[PDB]
Ligand binder design. Structure first.
Ligand SMILES: O=C1N[C@]2(CCc3cc(Cl)ccc32)C(=O)N1Cc1ccon1
Ligand SMILES: O=C1N[C@]2(CCc3cc(Cl)ccc32)C(=O)N1Cc1ccon1
Lengths: 305, 305
C-alpha cells in the first residue's frame, strides 16, 4: 500500500541524451536514430534573445558549427533543419541505445516524467503535469534547455515535452517534439503571462479514489451531487469543469471502491467549502492534482515496463 | 528555479534487476558482478511466515531450486548462502551492466531513491527518506520484495535499502544490502509496531532554505532563537532535536541566503506554533522533511551523474 509521486524509470531516455553546443551556447539534445533534437534557441546569443530572427540566424550556421557530444564521444553532423521551434541535427551514426518511441502532443491535465539534464548528463527524474494554462511546474536551472518529458508503455517511450524556457513567474514552458509550443508562448525573452492556473478536477478525484483504496477515508461524506451542481462549485474555486468523459474515465476506480463518481464529487465539494481542518490525505495537506486516473490504476496495480 | 521531489536517474539500477523464484514465491533480486541478492523470505511459503526457521528451510533447498531470470534469459546458480536476512545467489555469469557500486548503511533522516519492481521489471522510481523510527513511507504492492533504494554520486551507485515487508500500519521495512534490518523489525508475519514517527528537523530547515532561494519568503520572521530554546519547542511537536552537527551541515545554505541557521530555526518555531494559515511553501501546505541539506544544494546547483 502507500501512494507516491512516482516517475517512470528513466534508463531508456538516459541513453538518448547528448550535449549540443553552437558557438558559446550549450544545451541538451535528444538523440534518436540518426537525428538529434534540440531547442532552436541553441543558435542564439543572449543579446539575440530579446527579438531573435531565427531564419536569419540560421543562415550563418553550417553543419560543422553544431557540436554534438554523446557521452565523451563526438557525433558527426551531416545535415540540419529547423522544424517549428526545434532544430533537427542529422548525424552520421544511429543511436545504438534508441528505444521504441513515439512523439505525442499531450492534453492539459496529463502527466509525464521529466529527466532533468545539464551538459547532456542526467541530474534527476520527477513527475510533472501539463497545467491547464499550458505551463509545467518543473525544477530547471540554466542549461536545462532540451531536457525532455516522456511516458512509457511497456517498451515504448512516448516523448511529449522538450524544455525551452522559464517565464518570469518561475514556471516553465516548452514544446512537443515537433517543435510546437504548448500554449501561447514563443522562444524569446519577452515578458509573457501564463493564464489562470486552475486545478485539474478529474485528477483530484482520481487521487481521492487512491486515498480510499489506501485506507484514508475520513473525507467520505454522506452526500451526493449532480454534475451541474458540482461544476458551479468548481468554477468558484478555479477548478476545471468536470464532463461526462471525465466521469467515464473514473469508472474503473468507482467500480473498485464502490463509490459512485458523483458521490466522490460531493465529498470533494465539501472539502472545497470546508477546507481540510488541519487533517491530511495521503500525507498531503492540500488536494493533489498531478495524478491521472490512469496513474492511479497503474500505481495501485503494479504495471511494469 | 522551482523545487521538486526528485529521484536519481534509475538506468544504472534498472540494468541490475532480476526475477528470483523459489518454489511458488517470486520476488526481485539485485544482480551485481556474479552475485544476486534477494530477501531470504523467498524460500518461505505463506504458512511459513508466521514463525519461519530460515536455517531449517534452507536445508531443503539446493542451487537448482533458485530460478533467476534476467530479462528473458536464465541465469545458472552455482552457489547460495544466507547473510543475515538476505540470500546471496552465486551465478556463473557476471552482470555486464554492473555499475560501480558500494553498499552503505544509512542513518535515519537520510534520503534515497527507490526503483519499485515486480517480477524483476521496473515499475517506477520515487524519492524516500529513512524515517527516525527506521521505516520508510513507500509505495509497494505484493511482489515488490527485493526492490532497492540507492543514491548516486557521479558514476557510483550506493545501495542502501532492500525492501522486505509492509507493517500492518501500511509503512515499509527492509534491510541494508548486508541483510541487516533497519530498526527492530524481523522478517516474520507478526504484528510489529514501528515507534513514534518524528519529523526530521534538519531536513525541514534545508527545505525552508530552498524555499527562500526560490523566492518563497513570507514565513521569514523578525526573530531569532537558541538551540536549547528551539529544541524545547521541537520536542513538543515531535521534531527531532537539532544539534550543532546539523547547524554545521546547513552552513552552505546559510551562506547562500544570508539567513543565520538560528534565525531560520526561529522562523520554523513560529510556523510550528502558528501553523501556516492556509498558505503554502513551495507548493506544500505542510512542512516537508524528505529533502536533506545535500539534496537542496544538489538540486539548486544542478549536479549531474
Ligand atoms: O538556460 C536557460 N536560459 C533561459 C533564461 C531565459 C530564457 C529565455 C529564452 Cl527565450 C530561452 C532560454 C532562457 C532559461 O529559461 N533557461 C532554462 C531555465 C532556467 C531556469 O529554468 N529553465
Ligand atoms: O509481497 C509481499 N508479501 C508481504 C505480505 C506480508 C509479508 C510479511 C513478510 Cl515477513 C514478508 C513479506 C510480506 C509483503 O509485505 N509484501 C511486499 C509488500 C506488499 C505491500 O507492500 N510491500
Amino acid at each position: 500500500s502507500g501512494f507516491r509521486k512516482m516517475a517512470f524509470p528513466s534508463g531508456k531516455v538516459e541513453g538518448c541524451m547528448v550535449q549540443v553546443t553552437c558557438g558559446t551556447t550549450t544545451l541538451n539534445g535528444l538523440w534518436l536514430d540518426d537525428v538529434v533534437y534540440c531547442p532552436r534557441h541553441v543558435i542564439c546569443t543572449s543579446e539575440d534573445m530579446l527579438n531573435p530572427n531565427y531564419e536569419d540566424l540560421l543562415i550563418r550556421k553550417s553543419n560543422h558549427n553544431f557540436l554534438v557530444q554523446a557521452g565523451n564521444v563526438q557525433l558527426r553532423v551531416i545535415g540540419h533543419s529547423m522544424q517549428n521551434c526545434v532544430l533537427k541535427l542529422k548525424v552520421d551514426t544511429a543511436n545504438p541505445k534508441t528505444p521504441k518511441y513515439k512523439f505525442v502532443r499531450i492534453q492539459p491535465g496529463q502527466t509525464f516524467s521529466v529527466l532533468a539534464c545539464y551538459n547532456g548528463s542526467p541530474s534527476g527524474v520527477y513527475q510533472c503535469a501539463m497545467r491547464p494554462n499550458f505551463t509545467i511546474k518543473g525544477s530547471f536551472l540554466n542549461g536545462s534547455c532540451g531536457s525532455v518529458g516522456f511516458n512509457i508503455d511497456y517498451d515504448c517511450v512516448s516523448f511529449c515535452y522538450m524544455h525551452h524556457m522559464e517565464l518570469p513567474t518561475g514556471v516553465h514552458a516548452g514544446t512537443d517534439l515537433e517543435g510546437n509550443f504548448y500554449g501561447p508562448f514563443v522562444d524569446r525573452q519577452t515578458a509573457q503571462a501564463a493564464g489562470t492556473d486552475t486545478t485539474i478536477t478529474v485528477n483530484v478525484l482520481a487521487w481521492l479514489y487512491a486515498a480510499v483504496i489506501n485506507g484514508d477515508r475520513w473525507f467520505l461524506n454522506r452526500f451526493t451531487t449532480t454534475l451541474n451542481d458540482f461544476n458551479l462549485v468548481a468554477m468558484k474555486y478555479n477548478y476545471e469543469p468536470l464532463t461526462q468523459d471525465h466521469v467515464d474515465i473514473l469508472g474503473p476506480l468507482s467500480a473498485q471502491t464502490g463509490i459512485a463518481v458523483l458521490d466522490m464529487c460531493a465529498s470533494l465539494k465539501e472539502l472545497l467549502q470546508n477546507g481540510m481542518n488541519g487533517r491530511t490525505i495521503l500525507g498531503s495537506a492540500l488536494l493533489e492534482d498531478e495524478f491521472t486516473p490512469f496513474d492511479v490504476v497503474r500505481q495501485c496495480s503494479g504495471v511494469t515496463f
